[PDB]
């Protein structure tokens, strides 16, 4: 029932929808939207579970 409310359908369209929430007002690109999702939880330097 959550997949009905999802406006995205693929991966690159979904990475834009995180950019429009995290950095709103700035138009997103391909390589700028890919590096933002990686830098949230999947980088050693900007995430630590300790």
């Amino acid at each position: 029932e959550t997949l009905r409310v999802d406006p995205t359908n693929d991966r690159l369209s979904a990475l834009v929808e995180i950019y429009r929430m995290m950095r709103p007002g700035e138009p997103p690109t391909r390589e700028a939207a890919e590096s933002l999702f990686e830098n949230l939880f999947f980088s050693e330097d900007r995430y630590d579970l300790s």
Binding site: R20, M21, R23, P24, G25, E26, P27
Partner: peptide, 25 residues
């Protein structure tokens, strides 16, 4: 054609209020 991509953004913005975003745009 890099100005029609702003009209794809400007009517659909997340209402930015930071002037550094508006200048770098």
């Amino acid at each position: 054609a890099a100005a029609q991509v702003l009209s794809s953004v400007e009517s659909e913005i997340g209402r930015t209020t930071d002037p550094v975003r508006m200048y770098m745009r």
